[PDB]
Structure 1
Amino acid sequence: HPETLVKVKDAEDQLGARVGYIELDLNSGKILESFRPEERFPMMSTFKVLLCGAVLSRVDAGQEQLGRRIHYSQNDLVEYSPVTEKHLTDGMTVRELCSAAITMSDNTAANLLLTTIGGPKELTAFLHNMGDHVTRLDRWEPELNEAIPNDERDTTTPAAMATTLRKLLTGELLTLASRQQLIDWMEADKVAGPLLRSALPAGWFIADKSGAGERGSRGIIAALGPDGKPSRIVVIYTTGSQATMDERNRQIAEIGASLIKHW
């Protein structure tokens, strides 16, 4: 809806920064609204959904098992590792690692999972092979959040991310079980409270993944809809703003409010 694009424009003005936006019909794959669809933004932690998509593909092919246990040490632990810091002694299963990476945005969990697939280069190769030749992951946590202006490392476009997410959640790539698991992890998101969720009416479904990084970078990818079922994908990114986390949160929630209003 036009007024949602006005809200996005409002956000650019008030943040003093670029905002990218896509609203995509989940079933038909038709783009309903867009803003800067072909411009690059740092993915930040939103890449963690793509990461577990690649892990689940390996699980489907038998190259990975969700119950496989990984042990690691104190020195593997990077900044913001709320789950992995608690399991030095017992290790974590692959399933637990993806849960930590998606629902809590655990950074060490993401690095361990990256190691299982062969690193950022192999995540990018995974994306390439499912038809996304735009999105690229280049670094590990936490350096991938650096968001140097015009640096194309660790970036996506709103259009590429939105269509890739649709393929992962509802396309032919993954088994039904793996699709359900990926969206289940996203529904269980615990660190995106002040974002789209804050605009979400009672009874609506949402499955999402937030991101935050340096230089004002903030974003969210989501499947959401009324009557307890997702029916649209929403992607929102911004980078470059000097604004507080709180203002950036409120802008994204406000775009969300408009999206919902004009559903």
Structure 2
Amino acid sequence: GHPETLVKVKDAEDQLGARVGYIELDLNSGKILESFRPEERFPMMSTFKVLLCGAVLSRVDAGQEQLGRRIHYSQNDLVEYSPVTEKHLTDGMTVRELCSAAITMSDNTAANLLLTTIGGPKELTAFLHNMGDHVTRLDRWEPELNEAIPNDERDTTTPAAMATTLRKLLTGELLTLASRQQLIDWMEADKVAGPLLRSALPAGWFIADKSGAGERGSRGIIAALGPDGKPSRIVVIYTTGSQATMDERNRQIAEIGASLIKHW
């Protein structure tokens, strides 16, 4: 081990006045390289949308779902922050287009439509349970799942549960090679995480990620990244409770990123 990245995480808790959870693990082996508050609960916020598309792709592999299936919805279905879904009220969107919106843009209505396809949030929790994650739970829809009430276990994960689940989705036995490639392709094309780990990422490095933001200062990111255009580690960072500006929360996550890249 080495101290420098955990010192940045402690610095982040000092300057945000809030808990930060962190885990760095080896993508192939699953070996934890370093951690901080690994068994504490944090609100998932939009980071759940990757797990949601993992559940959709499992159903695609089984033939219970088709990526080209077209879904139509109405004005009444649109919730706050629906940048893609708000443009397709007349033509609808394919399951594939919905997962692209939920992951690349964090589209909230797209995540609700996908949750409907699997029977809702408790059915996402049953999928996670069945793949060996007995900690992570989704309970509510967009936008209520972002409430981040202190001590409320609803819509929460731990850094260690989320990192091990993301490893199993991206590189584990659960999904076909085609479904693994699609999930990381969506994450690679994330457009709403620019000021987080991507701000620290050197030129030729790979990153596939998913950001989140909720109430009470809740902010986080899940990522597969590494040098030479190939992912080799998973990083999960969560914080909740901070009264700091979004820009300070973003800078703290990017500073933890700069540290873990420097000490790779």
Short-chain TM bin: over 0.9
**SS state of the match for residue 83, structure 2?**
coil
Deviation at 1:217, TM superposition (A): 0.1
Q: Deviations over 1:130-164 (max 9, x none)?
A: 00000000000000000000000000000000000
How many Å separate the matches in 1 of 2:22 and 2:141?
Answer: 25
**SS state of the match for residue 210, structure 1?**
strand
How many Å separate the matches in 2 of 1:49 and 1:90?
Answer: 25
Q: Deviations over 1:25-53 (max 9, x none)?
A: 00111000000000000000000000000
Deviation at 1:2, TM superposition (A): 1.5
Alignment match, 1:232: 233
Alignment match, 2:206: 205
Query: Percent same amino acid among aligned pairs?
Result: 100
Q: Deviations over 1:142-192 (max 9, x none)?
A: 000000000000000000000000000000000000000000000000000
How many Å separate the matches in 2 of 1:255 and 1:169?
Answer: 23
Over 2 Å off, 4+ runs: none
Alignment match, 2:219: 218
Q: Which runs of 5+ in 1 are unaligned?
A: none
- 2:160 aligned with 1:170, yes or no? no
**SS state of the match for residue 173, structure 1?**
coil
How many Å separate the matches in 2 of 1:45 and 1:82?
Answer: 14
How many Å separate the matches in 2 of 1:75 and 1:179?
Answer: 33
**SS state of the match for residue 161, structure 1?**
helix
Give the number of equivalent residue pairs: 263
**SS state of the match for residue 46, structure 1?**
helix
How many Å separate the matches in 1 of 2:164 and 2:5?
Answer: 20
**SS state of the match for residue 153, structure 1?**
coil
How many Å separate the matches in 1 of 2:3 and 2:138?
Answer: 33
Deviation at 1:78, TM superposition (A): 0.1
How many Å separate the matches in 2 of 1:243 and 1:75?
Answer: 34
**TM-score for the superposition, normalised by structure 2:** 0.99
How many Å separate the matches in 1 of 2:76 and 2:134?
Answer: 34
How many Å separate the matches in 2 of 1:159 and 1:57?
Answer: 22
Deviation at 1:111, TM superposition (A): 0.1
Give the aligned CA root-mean-square deviation in angstroms: 0.3
**SS state of the match for residue 168, structure 2?**
helix
**SS state of the match for residue 211, structure 2?**
strand
Deviation at 1:58, TM superposition (A): 0.2
- 2:114 aligned with 1:113, yes or no? yes
Q: Deviations over 1:200-254 (max 9, x none)?
A: 0000000000000000000000000000000000000000000000000000000
Alignment match, 2:8: 7
How many Å separate the matches in 1 of 2:204 and 2:39?
Answer: 33
Q: Deviations over 1:91-138 (max 9, x none)?
A: 000000000000000000000000000100000000000000000000
How many Å separate the matches in 2 of 1:162 and 1:257?
Answer: 19
Q: Deviations over 1:35-85 (max 9, x none)?
A: 000000000000000000000000000000000000000000000000000
How many Å separate the matches in 2 of 1:92 and 1:223?
Answer: 27
**SS state of the match for residue 96, structure 2?**
helix
**SS state of the match for residue 40, structure 2?**
coil
How many Å separate the matches in 1 of 2:29 and 2:127?
Answer: 24
How many Å separate the matches in 2 of 1:211 and 1:77?
Answer: 19
How many Å separate the matches in 2 of 1:37 and 1:184?
Answer: 27
How many Å separate the matches in 2 of 1:98 and 1:19?
Answer: 28
Q: Which runs of 5+ in 2 are unaligned?
A: none
